């Protein structure tokens with residue numbers, strides 16, 4: 001007699017440290033959000049951000065877009081039996097407010113205050129008009145007041161025995177190499193859930209992963225798999241995958257690099273364009289990603305997923321700078337004044353200084369690693385000296401947060417409209433803060449651009465959104481702020497050996513991936529049956 005264990009892989013680790021604190025995204029385990037702490041609403045981003053109501057049953061914006069009310073579902077219990085109510089929501093937002101350390105999404109710059117209207121209704125007051133704020137609100141973890149009010153210091157609290165609202169709150173097994181997370185005994189949506197436990201094995205990199213997945217040892221994964229047909233697909237007809245289109249991937253350059261020679265090059269827009277034209281994006285896609293991507297030749301990073309949003313006069317004006325043109329790259333370096341003056345074949349800065357660009361991508365992310373090595377070779381052909389680095393994710397991340405890096409290859413989260421990409425990638429407000437992610441850390445700062453970003457949802461009118469879009473697109477393309485390469489894919493592999501009900505090509509219910517930060521994975525696990 002065997003419980004239905006579902007084997008998932010949301011995040012690389014070399015060893016598991018027991019940490020289920022949903023506010024500490026950089027050091028916690030990646031089954032905490034959604035699976036332990038259910039959100040108020042899941043927005044189905046693949047289906048136009050259609051709201052799927054979970055712990056909330058409704059929300060409504062005020063007419064001036066300066067406040068919003070959430071109705072809380074009745075009958076819901078924490079895993080320890082205690083009732084879930086508006087108090088828990090109000091508490092959670094007050095906690096993040098007082099301790100900005102715990103704000104990983106930037107909610108503190110939208111919500112000025114939160115109040116309980118009654119036991120199942122919460123009101124949010126805004127600092128500024130935002131018709132999209134319910135989406136932002138839904139990113140904040142909601143935790144139980146009767147536990148966290150008694151917590152010491154939440155920013156170091158490891159929360160080893162979690163009390164949660166989600167489907168899997170019980171820590172059945174924990175070891176450095178394996179943990180098993182089982183059904184919440186008081187789960188409100190238990191009738192809808194047919195999986196008994198989440199089984200989470202320790203896997204450090206894509207190499208260790210490839211061995212395990214081809215051998216049929218996984219159920220639900222979202223890792224890069226090299227040569228997936230001959231390696232994994234051909235291993236069994238039970239081995240399936242579905243890779244729908246995802247977000248932008250780019251080389252991001254540090255505008256505040258402390259080295260004089262490097263700073264001179266990186267902050268030069270002719271240099272960023274020459275760098276960009278040296279890249280053979282299609283070769284990166286074919287070789288490093290085995291076809292799993294689309295060329296991104298928008299200087300703004302927009303991508304072909306959102307070409308309806310594109311001001312095509314802006315896109316075509318700067319398109320040439322974001323296509324493969326090695327002769328053009330060499331000519332631009334020459335015109336700009338990046339001349340090789342010490343006879344080694346690599347261009348030097350206008351002030352005569354030699355330099356090498358260190359390009360980083362995360363350890364274990366072999367598709368990104370191979371991308372950077374291909375770029376290093378393509379750059380050398382036009383006389384730009386570069387070297388690849390593959391630091392551990394925490395080191396990669398910290399070096400961006402601190403501004404010590406030169407160039408970083410990174411992907412971005414992908415929304416229902418271009419705002420998820422553009423805001424996270426360019427809003428200068430997101431360049432400061434301990435909880436802040438890496439995405440905005442080039443430290444290019446443009447007050448006009450921030451102004452446009454912060455006004456994107458001042459109205460409900462989508463035609464005025466589209467025009468703000470066009471303004472944003474123009475600013476970023478004009479300055480070639482990053483070097484966009486491709487639009488990636490939501491890599492997703494599923495095994496029909498032990499479970500059915502999977503999302504796929506024929507059943508495209510939403511983003512199918514198992515990563516933290518994909519709230520839809522809650523809704524996906526609810527569709528699975530043994």
Ligand SMILES: CC(=O)N[C@@H]1[C@@H](O)[C@H](O[C@@H]2O[C@H](CO)[C@@H](O)[C@H](O)[C@H]2NC(C)=O)[C@@H](CO)O[C@H]1O
Pocket residue numbers: 009010011012206221222223224364365366367368411412413515516517
């Ligand atoms: C936007 C973002 O940061 N996404 C992260 C994912 O990219 C990442 O998944 C990893 O992506 C690598 C690059 O394509 C893959 O090589 C790697 O196999 C994959 N790892 C896993 C476990 O799926 C995840 C996890 O590191 O974090 C996301 O936030």
Ligand SMILES: [Ca+2]
Pocket residue numbers: 191192193194526527528
């Ligand atoms: Ca179900």
Ligand SMILES: [Ca+2]
Pocket residue numbers: 339340341342343344345346347348354
């Ligand atoms: Ca030289």
Ligand SMILES: [Cl-]
Pocket residue numbers: 297298299300301302314315318473477
């Ligand atoms: Cl563009």
Ligand SMILES: [Mg+2]
Pocket residue numbers: 190191192193194
């Ligand atoms: Mg059930």
